[PDB]
Design a protein around this ligand. Structure first.
Ligand SMILES: CC1(C)S[C@H]([C@H](NC(=O)[C@H](N)c2ccccc2)C(=O)O)N[C@H]1C(=O)O
Ligand code: NA
Ligand SMILES: [Zn+2]
Ligand SMILES: [Zn+2]
Length: 240
């Protein structure tokens, strides 16, 4: 698979069905799925799979229900542990397109309350549970029970008003979803639903919430250094 948008296949990538998986840490993998757009080619999107405490936690669906079912089948073959929950990082197809497949499999799903409120308007199925956030961006703990090492942070409006981010405690990894672009990116992607006034502050807030992380994982590029955060913020500075 050679995407028009998104990272290409490299050493360390395992093809499974129509998906690609890459191990990032002993208990963390990146899932990649592709949306084939007529006349344009494939768009890759990345999410995470985390093994913690005898279970698996998923960050983001694939673009489709079938692709998300294939993620669950890869988990069964390679990890063979129950998938306890999924957190999805905003109400757009690349992050929430496969909700029905998670629900059919009995997996509990979580999203920002605002993602769930926007979901139908965005063509998405809402998650079963809503996360809420303090004014400082951190998830209200009672809304995110039994999240293991996942640290869920709402950085403010940016790529969308509802975008959230996830760090993995005890690892070098933080996940910016579609908010963060890589350090060589030429644009901020689709700004159609974006908050151009607050984007730069939201990117910087993500960086400050996860100060230690050296591996920055994002929706449409390979994992990068913290230069992805700095570059995203500087690009966003130009929007205001
Ligand atoms: C890769 C994208 C430019 S498209 C994706 C998202 N768009 C979708 O999920 C749409 N369903 C879509 C429409 C046509 C082709 C591909 C995706 C968005 O608008 O943020 N995230 C964007 C982004 O992360 O900047
Ligand atoms: Na929209
Ligand atoms: Zn989006
Ligand atoms: Zn995206």
């Amino acid at each position: 698979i050679r995407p028009t948008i998104g990272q290409q296949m490299e050493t360390g990538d395992q093809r499974f069905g129509d998906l690609v998986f890459r191990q990032l840490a002993p208990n963390v993998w990146q899932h990649t799925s592709y949306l084939d757009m007529p006349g344009f080619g494939a768009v890759a999107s990345n999410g995470l799979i985390v093994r913690d405490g005898g279970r698996v936690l998923v960050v983001d669906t694939a673009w489709t229900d079938d692709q998300t079912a294939q993620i669950l089948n890869w988990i069964k073959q390679e990890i063979n542990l129950p998938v306890a929950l999924a957190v999805v990082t905003h109400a757009h197809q690349d992050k929430m397109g496969g909700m029905d497949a998670l629900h059919a499999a009995g997996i509990a799903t979580y999203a920002n309350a605002l993602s769930n409120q926007l979901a139908p308007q965005e063509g998405m199925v809402a998650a079963q549970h809503s996360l809420t956030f303090a004014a400082n961006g951190w998830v209200e703990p009672a809304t995110a029970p039994n999240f293991g090492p996942l640290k869920v942070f709402y950085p403010g409006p940016g790529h969308t008003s509802d975008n959230i981010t996830v760090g993995i405690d005890g690892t070098d990894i933080a996940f910016g979803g579609c908010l963060i672009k890589d350090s060589k990116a030429k644009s901020l992607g689709n700004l159609g639903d974006a908050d151009t006034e607050h984007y730069a502050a939201s990117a910087r807030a993500f960086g400050a919430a996860f100060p230690k992380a050296s591996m920055i994982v994002m929706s449409h590029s390979a994992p990068d250094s913290r230069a992805a955060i700095t570059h995203t913020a500087r690009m966003a500075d130009k929007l205001r």
